[PDB]
Amino acid sequence: AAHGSNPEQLKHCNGILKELLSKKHAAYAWPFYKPVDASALGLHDYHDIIKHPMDLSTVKRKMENRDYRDAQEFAADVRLMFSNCYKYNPPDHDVVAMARKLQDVFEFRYAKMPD
C-alpha cells in the first residue's frame, strides 16, 4: 500500500544505513559490512543454521535498487541480520556484543522516524 510518506521514511532509513556504515561505529559495525564468508571462517554449519543470511552491503544494494517499498521492509532486514548473529553464536561471544551495540544505534534512530 504505497503511502505518500513512504519516500520520506525511506530517506530516513537510508540515513540510518549510512550512519551504520560510518567511521563513528566502525569499531563494532565491521563484522556486518559484508556477507558472512562461512567457509573462510571455518563455520561449516552456518548455512544449516542460518537459512536467510543478511548484511549491511546487501541492505545497501537493496536500498540502491529501490527494492524496499517501505520502512518496515528495511527494518525487517536490519533486524534479521542481528537475529542471525544471536541465533548462531553463544551469547557471550564478542561478535554478539558488537551486534547488540550496533542494534542499539539502529533501534534508537529508527524510533525517531518522521511520521
Ligand SMILES: O=c1[nH]c2ccccc2c2ccccc12
Ligand atoms: O555471526 C557471526 N559469527 C562468527 C563467529 C566466528 C567468527 C566470525 C563470525 C562472524 C563474522 C561476521 C559476521 C557475523 C559472524
